[PDB]
Symmetry: D2
Subunit: 351 residues, 4 copies
């Protein structure tokens, strides 16, 4: 029961300032950290060869969008490769991001791995040599990191083991990041797969988040210098019962209010399988919810910010402006939504 | 995991409505639940025989103060004996409290017991037949309960066992209370005993509360239907280093912001060994702290609300007015304090 | 962590000595601690008015059985009421038990209570004032205690909450008992209700026992001064798959070997819904199981020792000898069983 | 909880058979997996240049000792580099070890890393891509693995965090190993550093092992397919109070009896900072301890088996026989020690 300060006042100040800048009023996060294997499907969906040059061009297309996105983007998550690529003018992408007012982020996990003795459950790896990697990323321009854990709702999942293990690994990851001046974004994604209803998702989300914050406490994590990337609370994809955006918002905010300490600087929602417009409407409803919300509630979207842009680009250089135009539109929409000012024009006890 | 609703929407509403009434803006709790074993020294200090009539009288004195205390008192915690006593006009004390706009609370724990294998640490008993007792107290006018767990800061304390066990018993007590329409006030008190500094108290407080809320979650506790009664974050009673009220407020608010979910309806601070004035000044500083506080931050005082009243009374029936006056004075001082409107007469370093 | 001795060397010796005496070779436990409310159904099945008198007589009938049971019974669990009753000759029941070489035990739990937010699960109450009660029971002849926790196998049970809470309360109870010179018998019973199979019971039993011993460790319990009373590992009552006694034994011994520390003095199996013969046959197979067992494997039976005796008695004092004879036969059968010498009339785990 | 078999009966059989062969009667383990960073200081002590050839030669010297060590060595732990080196006759070292009746082990952890917010405490890394590494090591002759976690006794250590985190990572490591047919040796080493006495080390050891076994249960680890490599229970190196070998054996065996399930196939002790003789004498006493021990109690020595050998070699190729002779002597002594055949008041525990 003795304190051996993991961080000095200066380190804490640096971490808190970074966290607040990322989620400042009206700003969200662009998740463009798709791996070479993940971006493969995206490129094949528009008949484009998956080469480093095409990946560079696509990332550049998004990162160099006009100044309208500046007040919309507080952070950009990149994959290792992209962090070391440069725009046509020779400027490193991280420099491009920063010049537009954004904070640079880096995915540091090494994917999921199966947990033996479970019903298809997983944990996430990537702690080995993480400290050295974080130190190097920090020096090369990154100020926050991304690590994704995945849990699934089923007849016997998430199990006590899966919940405990994933929460523990997220805590180790956050601890290492903070020692290197990197703001860790804690991401305990609960998949929407299944036919469960809204109440089930809320229940599981509340249990998962409770475990997550207890682990962060056990590992002496500085909450003010962290962000949370949870799933919104929604029914399963195969759920027959229909719900309004107001219900999704109330269930989501209620779950968060019951588990997330106010010290947490911000919540950057993942959109999962939601469409671009759906992700904006729900994020807006969440911000409109008539309950006290002590943390910034914004976005960290990948598919919900690029979907149309990728399609508009089609891998043709001539559609550059049209592609960027699609991305900018979603950036503005979500900027308004994370403020509860979004519009298509441009009982609590039951939870 | 799988859900099996512990409460219906109707039961949740009842509990949440009660919790909010107790900590309504400007209101706090009067802790007058001293057991016959604790009230003994109180009466002894004023040379008064510890009889049932004298205890009944003293309680009446506090409970029947003029209407100036009404806006200040959201709840009153009573000891079993008192819940069944009556004022001179024949009215049961629970009726007297309610008629003044207050909610009636009842202590339900059965005191602390030693934890074997620890350095003088304890847990708290009182769960046996608690459900039946709560059902009866509810029928007899009580809407909330009190249960006190005690932890101590020392070289090897609080130990992992003490923290886990006390957090678990609080969760059990909370669960049983809510099943009976009684709002449980979770009280995990960390004593000020010792010469530890402010930073040490904040660290321990943070660890204890994280454990308390994880336990409440494990036992499916409805937080909106609960209140928290923690110690403020202050240096040890014998700490050589000195701090300002602002530092105590910052350390306290920070600790809470890092561990207490916004869903918790309110925090009713215990004053520990602080004086009446000090308790009011710190609560005021806490409410003036430049950090976001998603829960009501008020009081649940015993000594800090009765110290002077008890002294002015002195066991003499002719000092009723004088005594009640002192009580009213502190009630008013704290009602303003829990709003940051009281005046006597870098956060990254936390 | 830091050590703050919960017990002195002398206290440890007393507890260990008591534990070993109870489960000494060939000895088991007669569980006769049925509460007046629980015994009511028993006396009802034999048209006998449930009165303190008839309860005293029935208990006397069992406690005063001939000396053939002496080497079979190492301990007797009594209900509060019985601990203070006397035989016709005036001898206090505890004295009767001890004279026959048995250790006196006392039930100290106050029954199960529902756990809100669970699918019909429970925890057990009884810790309030337990220290004072144990000290009084010790002064009055008791050397060990019984506390029963109950878990059930279902679609969502036993839940993490139920497992954690029951293991924790068991540790609290054990801690308090040891502080008063009383050997605590930890009983985490997993009901046989349901249609689950053998491996499902084995799995749950293993998880439950692992939780139980972690809790005992967290609470600084002196294992050598304790006994474990678990269910045998068997398929659910409604399971359609059939198993042999050798399979039940293998599953049972395997489960214990993977969770119970060698330091535990002995395992006193509860018989659950098993008949008298079934309980003896299974205990025998368990003791014959090839695997190495570092603890005594015996019985702590209530229904499996009294069934026939109760029926033979029928509330008629005239049936005293006939009734006692039935009890003696089961006592003898199980004494041989806990030694693997009873005869009526492993990677797959 | 619901069962989702981590292993098939076939997989369990393979792991169990491997574990039993490593600790077969009279057999122990040679720990020659010194990291290239640790071996450097060893070669330095004998003015020998730290080259790949010298390292290869030294390992060859130990692995090619006369047949007298065959009955003594059940397993040999190797570092990655050595696993792929060959003897002068072209035979890969794994083949050499196997031809002498030994099982090949491989160190798979990637060292300790600091735990932020603690008083100099650490956890261990090495899980990333461990499954693929294990599958490859299995194909290359390895049947068991080594992973070391380190805890220290102090005023505020081991902390709740250090214990929990280290037990958890050990469990993750063991799970991945068993999925690849590799027997994991769980090594939660508690350093002897400090002035604490015997009872303090025993207390901490019991708390650590209880946490370790709860974690292995939570992670569904097959205990019969695992081995435990703990520190012997001894006072700190700077402790004033002196203890006899019998007391060390008693405290050590008591700690294990109170925490290690009988299902664990064997305990392979690390010698810490003990001398070659000290390590053999203590192991002998442990095996002679009166208490019941349901698991094999043997050795997994590095310094305690190589000390004299390394000195006799001195980097001189002509001192091969002399060096090997020193190793053989220690292997023979320890082979007898793990049988309690070597000769150069339990309630108080
Ligand atoms: O529509 C997408 N995926 C999907 C749709 C439908 C089914 Cl059935 C499964 C998966 C999608 C589109 C992207 C566009 C641009 C960047 C990243 C993208 C990632 C992405 O997949 P995701 O990582 O958001 O799950
Ligand atoms: O004078 C008191 N306490 C004290 C004095 C001096 C030292 Cl040094 C320590 C503690 C006191 C006075 C009260 C007056 C009226 C109600 C409750 C009272 C409770 C109380 O003691 P407490 O239960 O608040 O600890
Ligand atoms: O025949 C019994 N029970 C039963 C049988 C069959 C079904 Cl289907 C359900 C319940 C029985 C008989 C006893 C006789 C004498 C003492 C204690 C006895 C306890 C007892 O039931 P129990 O308290 O051990 O659960
Ligand atoms: O004498 C040794 N170390 C030591 C001595 C004294 C202090 Cl103070 C600290 C450390 C030693 C000797 C070896 C000889 C041969 C192989 C491996 C060896 C490893 C080894 O160090 P270790 O891994 O056993 O701790």
């Amino acid at each position: 029961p003795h304190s051996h300060p993991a961080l000095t006042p200066e380190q804490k100040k640096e971490l808190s300032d970074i966290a607040h800048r990322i989620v400042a009023p009206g700003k969200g996060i662009l998740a463009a950290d798709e791996s070479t294997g993940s971006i493969a499907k995206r490129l094949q969906s528009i008949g484009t060869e998956n080469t480093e040059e095409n990946r560079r061009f696509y990332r550049q297309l998004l990162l160099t969008a006009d100044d309208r996105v500046n007040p919309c983007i507080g952070g950009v998550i990149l994959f290792h490769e992209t962090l070391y690529q440069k725009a046509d003018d020779g400027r490193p992408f991280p420099q491009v991001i920063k010049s537009k007012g954004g904070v640079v982020g880096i995915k540091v996990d090494k994917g999921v791995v199966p947990l033996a003795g479970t019903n298809g459950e997983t944990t996430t790896q990537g702690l080995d040599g993480l400290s050295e990697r974080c130190a190097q990323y920090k020096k090369d321009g990154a100020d926050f990191a991304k690590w994704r854990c995945v849990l699934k709702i089923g007849e016997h999942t998430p199990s006590a083991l899966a919940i405990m293990e994933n929460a523990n690994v997220l805590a180790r990851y956050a601890s290492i990041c903070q020692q290197n001046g990197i703001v860790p974004i804690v991401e305990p994604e609960i998949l929407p797969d299944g036919d469960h209803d809204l109440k089930r998702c809320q229940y599981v989300t509340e249990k998962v988040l409770a475990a997550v914050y207890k682990a962060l406490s056990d590992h002496h994590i500085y909450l003010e210098g962290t962000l949370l990337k949870p799933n919104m609370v929604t029914p399963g994809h195969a759920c027959t019962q229909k719900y309004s955006h107001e219900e999704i918002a109330m269930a989501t905010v209620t779950a968060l209010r019951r588990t997330v300490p106010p010290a947490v600087t911000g919540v950057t929602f993942l959109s999962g399988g939601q469409s671009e417009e759906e992700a904006s409407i729900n994020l807006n409803a969440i911000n409109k919810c008539p309950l006290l919300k002590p943390w910034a509630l914004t976005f960290s979207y990948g598919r919900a910010l690029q979907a149309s842009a990728l399609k508009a680009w089609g891998g043709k250089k001539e559609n550059l402006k049209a592609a960027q135009e699609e991305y900018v539109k979603r950036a503005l929409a979500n900027s308004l939504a994370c403020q509860g000012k979004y519009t298509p024009s441009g009982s609590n006890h039951a939870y």
